[PDB]
């Protein structure tokens, strides 16, 4: 019977990464999570293929900061004791930070399950 894909639009959210302000979004094919520093006219500094993402975590509501943390699959010759690569994005929209985190989280979780 029927097959449905997510139809919510791709958001562009104000976020800090490694203490630099930028924009977190997805590529138009919804296959990469990309973060670009402001002004966001250059190339992404982070490009994470959703196929390589193994975990999605968040600060709980009421935390000092609204953060999503994405974990990637270990690099090929990483040592077996080493932590996996991780990426923390702090949402900085003065009123909508948590809403915006929620929207990205929901869209990513849907895409990750659909693959
Ligand atoms: Cl919150
Ligand atoms: Cl949910
Ligand atoms: Cs936005
Ligand atoms: Cs995945
Ligand atoms: Cs997983
Ligand atoms: Cs907060
Ligand atoms: Cs490894
Ligand atoms: Cs990192
Ligand atoms: Cs901001
Ligand atoms: Cs699937």
Residue 101 domain-assigned (yes or no): yes
Residue 100 structural domain: 13-114
Q: Where residue 36 sits, what CATH number does that domain have?
A: 2.30.29.30
Q: How far is the CA of 29 from the centre of ligand 4 (A)?
A: 15
Residue 66 domain-assigned (yes or no): yes
Contact call for residues 90 and 13 (beta carbons, < 8 A): no
50/92 Cα distance (integer angstroms): 23
Q: How far is the CA of 49 from the centre of ligand 7 (A)?
A: 18
Q: Where are the beta strands (DSSP E) in 1-115?
A: 13-17, 20-26, 32-37, 46-49, 53-58, 66-72, 86-91
Residue 3 domain-assigned (yes or no): no
- Tokens describing residue 104: 């990205």
Give the technique used to solve this structure.
X-ray
Q: State the total domains in the chain.
A: 1
Q: How far is the CA of 89 from the centre of ligand 6 (A)?
A: 13
């Amino acid at each position: 019977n029927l097959y449905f894909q997510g139809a919510m639009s791709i958001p562009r959210s104000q976020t800090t990464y490694k203490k630099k302000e930028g924009i977190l979004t997805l590529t138009e094919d919804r296959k990469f999570l990309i973060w670009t520093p402001l002004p966001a006219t250059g190339p992404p500094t982070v490009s994470l293929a959703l196929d390589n993402i193994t975990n999605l975590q968040q600060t709980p509501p009421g935390s000092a900061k609204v953060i999503l943390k994405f974990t990637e699959r270990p690099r090929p010759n990483a040592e077996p004791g080493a932590p996996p690569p991780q990426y923390m994005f702090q949402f900085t929209h003065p009123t909508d930070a948590r809403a915006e985190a929620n929207a990205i989280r929901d869209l990513l979780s849907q895409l990750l399950a659909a693959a």
